[PDB]
Ligand binder design. Structure first.
Ligand SMILES: O=C(NCCc1ccc(F)cc1)c1ccco1
Length: 291
């Protein structure tokens, strides 16, 4: 799967909010482009002159994520975050020249991402009360991965002492994206666990934080809520469900070729961190069938 790389796999079946620190610092920002940020301004001008209803928005930038030694007390993850924007994204990661920016970043800074916006995404492995994961079909009109299968998620917008508020907005944002797109009540959702971070190599390496969320509704109830919103209540064109039993071997199915890179990241991390039992009971052949 060359289109996705794992940057982080969380321990202990995934990390809760209270175990994560953020450092939000202008040291974690994109570096100015070698020939100047005028190239970004020029792409943005061209785009607004064809689609003048477009608007910019701030985004978090992922610089890096350091895990503590396993089994330790205290905070288990440090996220190093800067600030970027939708405009910077369109001028770097989504540029035809994005691979040239990665090579120049390697040369100048020893960092393939130094010249890339790299806005941070969130996604969820969302499980139902009857043990299915939730999948969504993308419109055939979107710029990236058109008509592909996705999971719930989005790209959160800004507004350990500013740090704890930033971790809170990240966890809050994945629940809000579930409520907005799947049309579920907030009180049917568990507090999220962070499974890990995955990079989309088809989008010049921009990362997404992948979470586990449990819903108290059945697959049939989730479907009713999604559909009862009508076509205008969601960006996706359909919803569907796969038994958690069957998610284990999804990379061997014809579905795998239809999954967008960030959804592949969510499913790989779900299988490694929530699946793959460690103990004698769940590890026994009748509960963990060989092959
Ligand atoms: O609108 C786009 N993507 C929506 C998701 C998103 C990605 C990155 C972001 F920074 C903010 C939102 C798009 C245009 C060209 C390539 O993708």
């Amino acid at each position: 799967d060359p289109e996705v790389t794992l940057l982080l796999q969380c321990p202990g079946g995934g990390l809760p909010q209270e175990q994560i620190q953020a450092e939000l610092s202008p040291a974690h920002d994109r570096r100015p482009l070698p020939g100047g940020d005028e190239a970004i301004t020029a792409i943005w001008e061209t785009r607004l002159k064809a689609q003048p209803w477009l608007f910019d928005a701030p985004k978090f930038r992922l610089h890096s994520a350091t895990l503590a030694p396993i089994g330790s007390r205290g905070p288990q993850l440090l996220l190093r975050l800067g600030l970027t924007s939708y405009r910077d994204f369109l001028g770097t990661n989504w540029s035809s020249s994005a691979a040239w920016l990665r090579q120049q970043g390697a040369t100048d800074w020893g960092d393939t991402q130094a010249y890339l916006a790299d806005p941070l995404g969130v996604g969820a492995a969302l499980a139902t009360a009857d043990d299915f994961l939730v999948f969504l079909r993308r419109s055939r009109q979107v710029a990236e991965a058109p008509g592909l299968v996705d999971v719930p998620g989005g790209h959160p917008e800004p507004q350990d002492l500013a740090g704890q508020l930033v971790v809170h907005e990240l966890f809050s944002s994945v629940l809000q994206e579930i409520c907005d797109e799947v049309n579920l009540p907030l009180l049917t959702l568990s507090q999220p666990l962070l499974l890990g971070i995955a990079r989309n190599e088809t989008s010049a390496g921009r990362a997404s934080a992948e979470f586990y969320v449990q819903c108290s509704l059945t697959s049939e109830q989730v479907r009713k809520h999604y559909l009862s919103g009508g076509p205008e209540a969601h960006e996706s064109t359909g919803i569907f469900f796969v038994e958690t039993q069957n998610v284990r071997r999804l990379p061997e199915t014809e579905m795998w070729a239809e999954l967008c890179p960030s959804a592949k990241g969510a499913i790989i991390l779900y299988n490694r961190v929530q699946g793959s039992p460690t103990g004698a009971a769940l590890g026994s052949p009748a509960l963990l069938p060989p092959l």
